[PDB]
Symmetry: D2
């Protein structure tokens, strides 16, 4: 072949988002990952599970990213998972999708690849538990779990409300969803993307 | 005098069997009214048939009715160390209950199942997180169940809640020891529900 | 008279201690609740604690054995990289005797924490819950009864898992009225539950 | 030598100690991996160590400061009610200096544990991961590469989160061939990743 000699690592940013907050974060993660020379980055969402009429009546945000299949997760060197919280877990849509990776699991297709997580909540509560409980699933697949620690200097500033934890980037949407991701939350997300992507390139 | 819901998800019947022992234990408590209900299957029916999903007798619960009980005992098989998507999808539809505080202060407790043991604890504790967001009182079982001191044989069950080991191929049935722990969990939670009423 | 509540804490620079007093004040609003505050023993040498500027504290030091004398224990700890502090862990490491005799079984347990920057405040509470579970304690989260948990206009601790406070990177931040109010609710709620169960 | 691996453990009755040697043995299979086993200092007074009958240990004692000298650290600890041991917690509580200078950032971390009767072996590993995360370490689970994890015909430790052993309530179980083999894999896997990252 010789098809694509310049790509060094492939990064999938896979997310679920209903009102677009994770969607916004996923784009910042991808922007950070694209800063690594040789990192090929693609954004994909998991399929919606609620009936289309019920997504419409709820005002769900239509999204441009392609819908991911479970099988193609095996094509990537690193997967960065984004999900809103549902009472301190990942969303049902993300859970249902990951529940379909059993074929990958049985063949060890995700073993040793890099995994990393970012989340969103309305009022903050559960933002850590959501990431940490997602790591468990990465572990069963044998993925290397990449936290972000305190490299992002924004994390030392507690003068304002802001998402972002050493476990991964987060954003706070507000109870009514009106809060948009801040520059500092987006800067943490970008760091997570670039950090993971650099690691994927180093491992290849 | 007290009402116990045993709410479960099951594909191959292992959780279903545990749920019946949990309910059996809960029925030993005078004044406890106990009912078993399942979470709705979410996968397409042709795929459940092809996968050999087990036909089950219990009626399906709706999300709104969780508020009618004094204690809810949640059963779920593990999916990579979480509750199943089916259980997650159902609990994701309890937001109305959450906003009105309808589950607040009620007793919640959890039991699980795995193929080879791994993840059985993470499944229970990560479910507890959701119970906490609803403000439910979280009931572990500790070491009241004496089977938990015996490590001479393969046996599910943890201080966090009852568990069973199905085997990689699903062929293992819940043992007498695992069912006894599940029964204990049911009886303990129900007695607590009666005392609080 | 009707229920005995222990507010058991560890504190280095006084933030948890301040939270502990608010937790106890909340529990004291329940008629019939006897509430006492105690701390776990310091583990670092006294001279090194002084050089680090540790806060001197009046509460009596608890012993492991006396935990069995209470109906509900509300545990306070600062975070150490997302767990309970070494001091608290060392203390709970001495409760195996209570574990072997089921002395804490079925009692109410509840947790509140403190961090410099928020990160880890949830993991600290939840990983403490694990220890309470091994003792068979009934775990009491607070959910969202405290309306202060809905206001994201200002930095403030408190989670559905239990009350928390944000000390700041340099520890100069004091617990806010909203953080104390969430702590007060936690105390009152747990104390109310202990009374109902007796 | 291409990478330096620290196997850092705490052990009271020798179970983690046995496991730690198998972990190191696995890591020494990787060409260029320099592997050393070290223990965290005991915290209880010697008179109480004697009455509890603690098993004396030959491995050198580690300092908090030297953790920055390694490319990968594999932490072993017995469980205490579903957390890491107080001794391990106390030791890691003194890595605050390492934290402020980012000295452990990006290094590989991995965990193995021990219990009497199984319960808590997973919570001990995952709650240890939290601390590694605050330090910005890369967290290495083992997944299901070790075939022994599919065999449920006999009592056996080991999880996708890390190797474990079951000592028995009275400590009479010694780590089995299968559990040590999982531990050997963990060491070999981590060491290979450490070499690749250098
Ligand atoms: C079922 C359900 C449970 C929720 N649980 C929480 C929660 O525990 N904590 C929280 O802050 N927000 C919670 N929310 C608020 C959602 O997290 C919020 O709308 C979401 O993060 C928005 O992200 P998105 O635009 O990417 O969908 C919940 C929402 C629903 C619908
Ligand atoms: C998507 C998927 C993920 C699974 N993850 C795990 C696991 O992490 N650990 C495990 O021991 N078994 C796992 N299994 C085995 C299941 O838990 C097992 O079939 C189940 O507990 C049977 O319970 P049931 O009869 O009620 O369905 C998994 C199965 C599926 C389909
Ligand atoms: C060893 C150590 C580890 C710490 N880890 C964290 C942390 O993970 N997250 C955080 O926000 N603060 C952390 N801090 C900040 C302390 O948690 C903070 O000073 C404490 O909550 C103050 O409470 P106190 O006055 O009751 O001691 C840590 C401090 C030390 C000494
Ligand atoms: C304070 C204390 C707490 C313990 N908690 C647990 C536990 O939660 N689960 C368990 O199986 N064993 C528990 N045990 C049994 C210990 O983990 C067990 O003896 C240990 O793993 C042996 O490892 P070692 O020889 O390396 O010390 C506990 C023992 C003590 C002293
Ligand atoms: N039996 C089984 C099946 C899947 Br898919 C994942 C795991 Br982990 C299992 O143990
Ligand atoms: N939007 C929203 C929904 C639920 Br359910 C819980 C919380 Br907290 C939220 O902020
Ligand atoms: N062996 C053992 C000792 C204590 Br103390 C607690 C537990 Br839980 C145990 O398994
Ligand atoms: N303030 C603070 C101090 C240490 Br040491 C660790 C963390 Br993480 C913190 O947030």
């Amino acid at each position: 072949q010789g098809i694509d000699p310049f790509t060094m690592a492939k990064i999938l940013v896979l997310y679920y988002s209903m009102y677009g907050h994770i969607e916004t974060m996923a784009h910042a993660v991808a922007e950070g990952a694209k800063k690594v020379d040789g990192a090929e980055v693609i954004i994909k969402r998991v399929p919606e599970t609620m009936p289309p009429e019920i997504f419409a009546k709820a005002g769900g945000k239509t999204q441009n990213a392609p819908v991911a299949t479970p099988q193609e997760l095996a094509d990537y060197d690193a997967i960065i998972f984004g999900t809103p919280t549902r009472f301190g877990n990942m969303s049902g849509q993300m859970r249902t999708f990951l529940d379909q990776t059993g074929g990958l699991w049985a063949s060890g297709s995700l073993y040793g690849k890099l995994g990393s997580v970012f989340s969103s909540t309305g009022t903050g509560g559960g933002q850590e538990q959501t990431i940490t409980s997602t790591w468990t699933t990465l572990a069963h697949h044998g993925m290397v779990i990449v936290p972000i620690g305190y490299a992002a200097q924004e994390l030392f500033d507690v003068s304002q409300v802001r998402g972002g934890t050493p476990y991964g980037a987060t954003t706070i949407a507000g109870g009514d969803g009106s809060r948009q991701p801040s520059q500092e939350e987006l800067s943490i997300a970008r760091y997570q993307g670039e950090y993971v992507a650099g690691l994927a390139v180093k491992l290849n």
